[PDB]
Amino acid sequence: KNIIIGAMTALITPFKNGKVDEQSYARLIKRQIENGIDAVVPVGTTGESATLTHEEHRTCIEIAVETCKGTKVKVLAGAGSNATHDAVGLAKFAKEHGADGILSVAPYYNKPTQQGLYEHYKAIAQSVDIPVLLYNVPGRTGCEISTDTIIKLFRDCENIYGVKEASGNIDKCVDLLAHEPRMMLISGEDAINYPILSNGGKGVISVTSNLLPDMISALTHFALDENYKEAKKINDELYNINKILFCESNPIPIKTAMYLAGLIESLEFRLPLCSPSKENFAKIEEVMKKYKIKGF
Amino acid sequence: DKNIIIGAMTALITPFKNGKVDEQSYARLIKRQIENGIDAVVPVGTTGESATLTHEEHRTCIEIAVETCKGTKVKVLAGAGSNATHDAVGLAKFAKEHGADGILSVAPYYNKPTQQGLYEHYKAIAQSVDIPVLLYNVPGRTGCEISTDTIIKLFRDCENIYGVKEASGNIDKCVDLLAHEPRMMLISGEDAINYPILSNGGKGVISVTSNLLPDMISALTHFALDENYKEAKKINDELYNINKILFCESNPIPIKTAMYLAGLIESLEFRLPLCSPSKENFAKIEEVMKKYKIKGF
């Protein structure tokens, strides 16, 4: 199976005067590349995929693909939907624009059954010839890809090679790798990056890496080299920032942090996302002071 | 004051035939709803597979609803929500143009807006049209919750926002809402607890069961609004089994299964990622249906 693993970043999407700030987007991708990141995830959850037009969706993927040419860095494009016809289109669309693989979130809101989830991903996987990584985040979608469904899709679809897990369920992560040890379990939850990696996970798709790519990159590769004492020691230092980056709904805290670090010009979201509370703004600022934030 | 749309309302299923919207079955079903005491129809809501319908099919179903309900008392409360505020504003203006009397606007799903964001989201929607706007809170589907304070603030600050459809299994919250803002129109979005919500001051239901048994849901709602709580509770108790079995799998998979079993739609067709039920739930739905008299056309 072709895979995309290692330290990966769910890229924020910076806005300037309500439009996508395309040059800062490219500049941020160069900061990830230069700090040990192995792949970037454009237009994911952290990238406010829900409020981007199809043209901006395309724009961010092509900026990501263009910026990563000549590097080892891959583009794992966000291309998921709660309508299978749309998800197939976004999958074919991300492939036609040079993405190395697609991250495909479980259908949100309309909550399909396991049989429906199977047919959903089977249709997506059969529409492209690039790796497909499942994305399970039940707190956001209202549904759960069961361990059995993930394993069947991994075994039945050639390009489906693993799953982003954002479920705070280390039991499920043991379930997955004990029954199907060939899948690429990817952590979608920064605080438990090390426990997932130490059980056989092969990478992270990180929110914290937007701000601290070098630390998330070092953590993952220490762990992949089975240097678990150095991986756990980075995981332990990151716990405070990992948690505070979710004091409000992601990506509200991480964009707040990027703005506080001077990495983006405007603290702009698209509604229904908005600036954090004045408290949470202050709490994020306080926790940031205990970390060294790389510049450009 | 405030313009309101209340009473017995149906979240219409959207029948498909050969992958297309059966517009001709759609009109027949709406005319079956009218003819059985329903006060309003909800096109392209959650039960209508709004997520897998194109914007053109969105228009088509709203239009059929507006046209089929012309000359009757039945209103059209169109589904017009999105997790992107710019899109929700567009769908709200869009629904007004096709004759909808009001809009049901689901809370932003997936992206979990904060309470502040939810307020600005709905304030933008309400200011874009001059027709009633009903909030829709279903946290099990959206991953977020419109708090009581946010609902009340929205009701008081925007003239088109007049209530909320509650699908949260939280009768405490419904007491919280009507005790602090008793002028609001609390609408039940949970068929099994239709009567408890109505007996606490709720002013209507937006029902899934009403697709199959519109006469029973209509009588239940009207009994309760006329304060005949013994007859309203008696229909609610009779409906409990079908109310639950219609959620043995994710709505609208069971209700469409029942509508097909009742011969009310031609094809048991969904749009992926929705699919036909398991073989066992097909049998369970069929068995529970047996105890109810299902009105025809």
Ligand SMILES: [Mg+2]
């Ligand atoms: Mg180069």
Ligand SMILES: [Mg+2]
């Ligand atoms: Mg090494």
Ligand SMILES: [Mg+2]
């Ligand atoms: Mg320091």
